[PDB]
A paper describes a structure:
Gram-negative species couple polymerization with translocation across the periplasm and outer membrane and the master regulator of the system is the tyrosine autokinase, Wzc. The tyrosine autokinase domain forms the cytoplasm region, while the periplasmic region contains small folded motifs and helical bundles. Autophosphorylation of the tyrosine-rich C-terminus of Wzc results in disassembly of the octamer into multiply phosphorylated monomers. We propose that the cycling between phosphorylated monomer and dephosphorylated octamer regulates glycan polymerization and translocation.
Reasoning the negatively charged Glu would mimic negatively charged pTyr (phosphotyrosine) and create a protein resembling a locked phosphorylated state, several Tyr-to-Glu mutants were constructed in WzcK540M. Analysis of cryo-EM images of WzcK540M with four Glu residues (designated WzcK540M4YE) revealed ~50% octamers, as well as other state(s). A 2.8 Å-resolution structure of the WzcK540M4YE octamer was determined using the same approach as WzcK540M. The core kinase domain is unchanged between the structures (rmsd 0.4 Å for Cα atoms 452–697) but the tyrosine-rich tail has undergone a large change that now places Y708 at the active site (compared Y717 in WzcK540M). In WzcK540M4YE, helix α23 is unwound, and the resulting loop no longer makes any contacts with helix α1, whose position is altered as a result. In WzcK540M4YE, Y706 points into the same pocket as Y715 in WzcK540M but this residue no longer makes the hydrogen bond with E675. The change in the tail results in a reduction of the buried surface area that holds the octamer together. The structure of WzcK540M4YE, chosen to mimic a phosphorylated state, showed a significant conformational change in the tyrosine tail, which would be predicted to weaken the octamer. The WzcK540M4YE structure shows that the tyrosine-rich tail would be accessible to the cognate phosphatase Wzb. There is some evidence for different oligomeric states (other than octamer) in WzcK540M4YE but none were amenable to structural determination.
Residue numbers in the entry:
A (entry chain H), B (entry chain G), C (entry chain A): 17 to 64, 85 to 261, 409 to 477, 494 to 709
The structure:
């Protein structure tokens, strides 16, 4: 978790980190390029206090007069069915539509919820056009006033592009004041000077300057019953969205979520990470088999594979460690199903067979052993058919043609695995084989699941646990070795398995 | 209690956590959707100080005149018998009722407690109607004034919906002023400017604007004997309830009570939680039997059950641990009643019997032993009938047909259990059985209750305590082993029992 | 990492440090000498408050009048195709071009994006000239007004130098105000005094004084409908760029990036740095061979080389350490490929051969051994052809003519290296050679890659690891020695190799 570990794991996770940071920055870029620009216009008003005037300009007396003058309760919006149609239309350089209605009158439905009745205008050409309110499309012309079904609408100088849609809202006068007041702002910048820096912000730049001029002139005429130094002009540079600030916030947010998520995943996993985690508990790791990219045995399929090199390292370390053992029986038990126990056992048997010693591979996993499904098999007369007494030692032994070693499958699943393994025929078999073979690899179920491994390991000189690299935890290995000790079985050490090529010391040589 | 433990237990308790948080958020949602909306109207008053004026507007001179003008001491409320009828009626979109009374006069009961006499109006149609005060329903019509029994009520423009009920309260003028003053508010926003931002809040939006206009105009006319810039208009967005703030508070409160309650339950329980709690005290846990979902023996009913796999693990660990013991008698004692002692003893006997050794199961719980109620029994001539000398060793031994092992029940409850067990016939029985059987499992009462276990364990080579997973505490096990030591009995170890499948290492295999 | 280490490594890295600091300071110098100078002019205005006046001077009423007077919306720039052409032109002492246009009128394209239509003027002589807008070059003369294609341009007193290019921009009046306002500044310096210290900054010094005089006089005439104490004069010393501040910032930035980068590289490397790093772990370093600057053996090519002196030191230390060893076989294994293992083994063999003892050099790296590619070879009948049984001990031994020692190459690459080395012929060979030779140096692959070294080291009395100086890490050496221990091989110590002459204690003597 230290800085060195941090940088190593971040480079290991660099794909995820850059992916999520880049996707957030892409969202930031698309938003900052599609967010409608907001322009700001400013005016300067001169008086000879000004504390009241901040509150008279923003009063519904002054603003409401501007709505009554510019007809700001008639709202016009170019229709884009997507949420980003307007932005993309601007990006393509398309001129945005605009029309002028000097007199609009909806049927005054003005319901409690839909107090803002909405109609859609369909432009057909530069002169004639139609409106769809709820289906009845009334064709009209600029100039002449259409008065049908309570629709009194007079549009003039309609825009050029045909086929466009304009949503029209006759929103209430109070709303048309409140939104203006929200977009409007006053300040003093002298704290006693007559200087008032009126600011109004909106999307339509030519419209906001007109609105602010109207506000200033209405305030002037009202105060007559004050000097407008310079009328309102719009700054051509939009003030929102702030493109630079958005993007850097996108980057910082992407990196911060990346860091929190990578630390979350680091504190998520609990499996083994290195042989030294087991060796701290006092467990001799005899090999760290790296994960092989690759039905035949890997030891005879691709003998030059790194996993087979690690298994040969295991063969030599076992050959040293298994001398002085009471007999030549080696019991390999996986710390869990899906620990790679039969992989390791079968290939270790093959690599010891090519050496030239006689190897017997007993699959004493009577519960879900499948070595017969992987070596090519005579399924009749396996191990369970022998412990049940209905077979002899010779009809159960086979020959793996590839690996070059003898093999005893489980046979049929018995209903009483543990009760079968306790039968004295099993020690008979082992005593016979240990005379007629050089090494016997017995392959047993876990010990955290059943007790079979602890029955078999009574007659085995060497017992080894197999742990998958990041699947099994240290707790499982420790509990398994303690449970083996309770039953009088000494687990010599562990075979850590399926270690990633990032963490394996093995590399291709030759 | 660490963060890892915290998250693990919260996911374990996620059902309760999400249930209570969701129910609080549901209460918050129903409240925020049923709480009557409160609208706010604002007006702006201009003067040329204003410190006194904050206190003249809110004076009973100005307000009381508005009550006298708008008849605000006549209260009208649509009747909803539930506490949430009004909210649900609004939610269904129903128009809320309202009527107008320009002249109301109750009989002026005006008692000390009920100084606000209440009557209920029953609307029958758009023109005629009736009132029930205390039973006498007087039928009346809008327009004409009904004057009966001191009821002078003139209602006009009664609402549309028939059959509704309106509770009418002629609350006192002082109350009609005090509530208005509570809902009314003034400020200055310039600290010297003539700007007064009058605000009045209420549920009826069209009514509060009228009230605030009346207040402003009364203040104007009074000050004549000041300028109203813009009259009162109501903001259509209700200011209360604050729906968003309520919901987030509901979520935060649900989570905080969830955390405090889960920590409370964590600090509530004191039972055993893991074998390592016992192993810290120096107690050898020989098995952790997981809780079986499942009258016959589980070892013969469902031999593939996980609990029977754990008992076979116990069988092998005992077989190793019981060699070198002075005799083949195993004494199993529960740390408490309801520790699963007879479950474990019976199934361990069955699993050792299927192996092929001769097992005698003695139920030396002479107080409330019920193995005979569970194996199928000849209740005559049990253990107590033998210690009393009125039976021989042969008429007391039985055969469990399922388990395949011999069995000795307690027989009849004696009046002197401990005094019976001390009789030298019991050691005679054990010395005989230990010659004619391979394993003898004696099943004894607790030691924190009686002394029988410490009498029996004098003749037992191996003694084992059985602790239920979260029922028995570590204190009970420690006190039991110390009390066994005082009596010269060595408790070899413990059998932790009924461990939950969340905490058991056993899993199904095959 | 301590101050002594810091200074030592900085002097070691002084080339990089001074290189990067000098390149940043060179960039700073070129920028500070090419950044266009910015002059500042100041004026003093006297009034009898002045808080409003700070905001009237900077108002678009006053500034816009100055643009309308001096035609500041007509922008003129001498064209330099590089980004630094203007700076270099000034540095060469060239007079900068300038022309005067009293009336300019572009075709008023004024598009949404290109609202600032740009044209380029091509001066041909002191009187006549031409303009290229988008290709159509219209020839014109100073004085007379050319009016073609909507181009109304009247330039007069055009500059001297022919062939120059002037980019002309009729930028909008609002932009011509906003840039001026950005460059303009007012202050009071008395906080109540009428003193206003107007400051205007720009590149053209004669132009900014004229602009500030125009601003002051326009403000004066406006306030008539205030006293200009001293008109605007430009300080001849440019105020930007601040040459001294830039250079010192360049130096400080260069040194700070140098420090952070050298510390980054220090915390980057993880290889061995000294023999004491290995000796801390308990590893006997027997030699530290320094890196030799130099196909024949270095021990016979340049016997006076420092690396050969270090190998003779290794020869004596080995001679002492290898007495009492079980046999005269020395196994040298590199901790990694590219550790210099065959370099060290071959030269140690040569230096022991010149002494006069019989040396056999066995190249038991059957995977990628190349001693035969370096001694001159008969490639037939190597080691692998002997273990396969298809050669005898005599046809595999050779004579290195230079080194003076016998030699056994690997031969052909076998498909089963480890399986070959396990054949009992290898111990036959060693037992024979250890009788017919004084020292046998067996050269083996790594142990972190294959298991061959641990097979060979079973029959070797002394085993030595070879670590490259900064390539191999301490972790590799420790893991290699532990993996050798697992297989029953005792690694006597290490030979640290390729140590830099900065860190080697060896020096030329004689």
């Amino acid at each position: 978790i230290d800085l060195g570990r941090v940088i190593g794991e971040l480079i290991d996770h660099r794909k995820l980190i850059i992916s999520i940071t880049s996707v957030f920055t892409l969202f930031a870029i698309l938003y900052a390029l599609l967010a409608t620009p907001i322009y700001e216009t400013d005016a300067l008003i001169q008086i000879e206090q000004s504390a009241p005037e901040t509150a008279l300009l923003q009063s519904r007396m002054i603003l409401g007069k501007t709505i009554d003058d510019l007809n700001l309760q008639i709202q016009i919006e170019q229709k884009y069915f997507p949420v980003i149609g307007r932005g993309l239309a601007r990006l393509m350089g398309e001129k945005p539509g605009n029309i002028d209605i000097t007199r609009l009158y909806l049927p005054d439905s003005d319901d409690i919820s839909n107090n803002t009745p909405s109609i859609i205008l369909t432009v057909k050409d530069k002169e004639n056009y139609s409106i769809n309110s709820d289906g009845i499309q009334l064709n009209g012309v600029v100039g002449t006033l259409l008065n049908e079904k309570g629709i009194s609408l007079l549009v003039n100088e309609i825009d050029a592009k045909p086929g466009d849609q304009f949503v029209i809202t006759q929103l209430p006068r109070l709303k048309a004041i409140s939104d203006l007041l929200k977009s409007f702002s006053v300040a003093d910048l002298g704290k006693d000077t007559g200087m008032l820096t009126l600011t109004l912000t909106g999307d339509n730049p030519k419209r906001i300057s007109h609105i602010l001029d109207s506000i200033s002139q209405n305030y002037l005429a009202q105060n007559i019953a004050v000097r407008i130094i310079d009328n309102a002009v719009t700054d051509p540079n939009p003030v929102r969205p702030k493109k630079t600030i958005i993007i850097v916030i996108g980057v910082v947010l992407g990196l911060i979520v990346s860091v929190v998520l990578v630390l979350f995943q680091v504190f998520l996993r609990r499996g083994i990470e290195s042989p030294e985690q087991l060796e701290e508990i006092g467990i001799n790791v005899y090999a760290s088999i790296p994960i092989s990219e690759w039905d035949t045995l890997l030891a005879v399929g691709n003998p030059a594979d790194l996993a087979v090199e690690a298994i040969r390292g295991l063969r030599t370390s076992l050959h040293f460690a298994m001398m002085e053992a009471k007999n030549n029986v080696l019991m390999i038990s996986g710390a869990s199903p899906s620990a790679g126990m039969t992989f390791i056992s079968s290939n270790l048997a093959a690599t010891i067979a090519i050496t030239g010693k006689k190897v017997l591979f007993i699959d004493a996993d009577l519960r879900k052993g499948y070595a017969h499904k992987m070596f090519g098999h005579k399924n009749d007369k396996g191990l369970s058919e022998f412990l049940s007494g209905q077979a002899a030692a010779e009809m159960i032994i086979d020959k793996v043609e590839g690996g070059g070693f003898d093999y005893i499958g489980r046979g049929q699943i018995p209903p009483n695995p543990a009760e079968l393994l306790m039968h004295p025929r099993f020690e008979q078999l082992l005593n016979w084989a240990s005379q007629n073979y050089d090494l016997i690899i017995i392959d047993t179920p876990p010990i955290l699941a059943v007790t079979d491994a602890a029955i078999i390991g009574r007659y085995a000189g060497t017992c080894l646990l197999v742990a998958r690299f990041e699947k099994n935890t240290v707790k499982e290995i420790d509990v398994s070795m303690k449970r083996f000790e309770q039953s009088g079985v000494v687990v010599k050490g562990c075979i850590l398995n399926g270690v990633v090529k990032k963490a394996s010391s093995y590399y291709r040589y030759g």
